[PDB]
C-alpha cells in the first residue's frame, strides 16, 4: 500500500537509531611489541594491564617461561599513541587488591640527556624489570 511502507520505514529508522545510540555509547588500535625478563612474576596473567601512573596503556600477551635458563619473558603490547618512552624506563609488578590479580607499572623515567638515549621502538627490550613481591619472605625479613 502507501502508508504501510511509511510505517515500515519509520520503524527501521527507529530500530537502527537505538543501535547507533547504544553501540556508540559506553566507548581496534595499532600497537607495538616490547619484551622484558623478570625473576618472579607470580600472579600476572595474559591480558593484564600495563599502566603509567594509573592509566592503562597496554596489555600483556605471553609471559611464557623460556627454556635453558628458567626465567619468565613477558611480551607487552603498548599502544601506538605512546611512542616516546625512553630506554631508561623500569618495570615493576604491583598487587592491585587481593587474591593475586597483579599488573605492570611502567614508570617513564625519561632523561633524554647527553649521550642520546634512544626511544623504545618495536621489538626492543626493557632491562630493569624489578620483580613481584612474595609476602612470605617479607615476614621472614621481619622475624628470621
Amino acid at each position: 500500500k502507501k502508508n504501510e511502507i511509511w510505517v515500515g520505514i519509520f520503524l527501521l529508522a527507529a530500530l537502527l537509531a537505538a543501535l547507533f545510540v547504544c553501540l556508540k555509547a559506553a566507548n581496534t588500535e595499532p600497537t607495538y611489541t616490547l619484551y622484558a625478563t623478570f625473576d618472579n612474576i607470580g600472579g600476572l596473567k595474559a591480558r593484564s594491564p600495563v599502566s603509567i601512573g594509573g592509566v592503562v596503556v597496554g596489555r600483556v600477551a605471553d609471559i611464557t617461561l623460556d627454556p635453558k635458563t628458567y626465567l619468565p619473558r613477558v611480551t607487552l603490547e603498548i599502544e601506538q599513541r605512546y611512542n616516546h618512552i625512553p630506554d631508561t624506563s623500569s618495570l615493576s609488578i604491583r598487587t592491585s587488591g587481593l587474591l593475586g590479580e597483579q599488573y605492570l607499572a611502567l614508570n617513564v623515567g625519561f632523561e633524554d640527556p647527553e649521550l642520546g638515549t634512544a626511544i623504545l621502538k618495536d621489538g626492543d627490550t626493557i632491562q630493569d624489570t624489578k620483580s613481584a613481591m612474595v609476602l612470605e619472605d617479607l615476614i621472614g625479613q621481619f622475624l628470621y
Binding site: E4, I5, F10
Partner: protein
C-alpha cells in the same frame, strides 16, 4: 519493496492491539461504583486467584529459601562471615526473588487460568448473552477479576518471603549450627523498612497490574475455538514473563542504583 510493506503491516496491527487493550481496561474500571453488587463477585474471584495459588507459593518458597541458605553458607564460610547468612537470605528475597519468582509462578498458574476462563465464556456465548440482558460484561466479568489479581499477588508475595526466610534459617541454624542469636540479630539491623520492605511492595504491585492486565486481555481477545484458546493461554505465559523480567531490571536500577 514487498518486505517493507509487510513489516509496516504488522506494525500497524500491533498498534491497534495496544489500543484494544487500553479500551478494555478503561471501560472496565470507570463508571457507577456498585459496591454492593460487586462485593460478592470479588470474594469468589479472590478464591480462584488467591486461595488456589497458595500451594505453589508456599512449597516453592521453602525450597528456594533452602537453596539460598545452602549456597550462601558455602560462600560465607570461606571468610568466617557465616553469621551474616540471615542478612544475605533476607535481603536477596526482599529484592529480586520474592517479587520476581512469585510473579512468574502467578503468571503460570493464575494467569493461565484467567485466560482460559474468559475465552471459554466467549466460546459458549456467555458474554454475548449478558449483553442481551442489558448487563455490561466489562463491568460485571472483567473488573471483579482485575481487582482480585491486584489484591492477591501482594498478599502471596509476603507469604513467599516469610516462608523463604524460615527455610533459610532451617538450613543455617538447625542444620549447620550457626548461633541463633547471631543469626537473627544480624538480620534485624540490616533490613530497613523503607529501602527493603516498602520497595518489595512497590515491585509486587507493578507486577500485579501487568500480569493481570495481560492475562485478562488475552482471554478477551482470543479466537473462540478450542485451538484458539490454547494458543492464547500460551501467549499469556510468554508475555508475562518477558514483562516481569524486563520491568525488574528497570526497577532495580531505580531503587538500588
Amino acid at each position: 519493496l514487498n518486505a517493507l510493506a509487510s513489516l509496516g503491516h504488522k506494525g500497524i496491527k500491533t498498534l491497534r492491539t495496544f489500543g484494544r487493550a487500553g479500551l478494555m481496561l478503561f471501560n472496565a474500571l470507570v463508571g457507577k461504583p456498585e459496591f454492593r453488587k460487586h462485593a460478592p463477585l470479588l470474594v469468589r474471584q479472590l478464591y480462584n486467584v488467591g486461595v488456589l495459588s497458595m500451594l505453589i507459593i508456599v512449597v516453592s518458597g521453602v525450597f528456594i529459601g533452602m537453596v539460598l541458605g545452602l549456597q550462601g553458607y558455602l560462600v560465607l564460610t570461606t571468610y568466617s562471615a557465616e553469621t551474616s547468612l540471615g542478612m544475605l537470605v533476607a535481603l536477596s528475597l526482599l529484592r529480586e526473588l520474592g517479587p520476581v519468582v512469585a510473579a512468574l509462578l502467578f503468571a503460570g498458574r493464575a494467569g493461565s487460568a484467567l485466560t482460559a476462563e474468559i475465552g471459554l465464556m466467549r466460546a459458549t456465548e456467555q458474554l454475548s448473552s449478558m449483553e442481551m440482558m442489558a448487563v455490561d460484561p466489562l463491568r460485571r466479568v472483567i473488573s471483579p477479576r482485575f481487582w482480585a489479581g491486584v489484591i492477591s499477588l501482594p498478599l502471596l508475595t509476603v507469604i513467599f518471603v516469610a516462608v523463604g526466610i524460615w527455610g533459610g534459617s532451617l538450613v543455617g541454624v538447625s542444620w549447620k549450627g550457626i548461633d541463633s542469636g547471631f543469626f537473627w540479630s544480624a538480620m534485624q539491623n540490616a533490613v530497613d523498612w523503607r529501602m527493603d520492605l516498602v520497595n518489595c511492595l512497590i515491585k509486587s504491585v507493578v507486577f500485579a497490574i501487568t500480569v493481570t492486565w495481560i492475562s485478562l486481555f488475552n482471554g478477551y481477545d482470543a479466537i473462540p475455538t478450542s485451538a484458539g484458546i490454547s494458543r492464547a493461554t500460551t501467549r499469556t505465559v510468554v508475555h508475562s514473563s518477558l514483562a516481569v523480567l524486563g520491568l525488574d531490571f528497570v526497577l532495580t536500577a531505580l531503587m538500588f542504583g
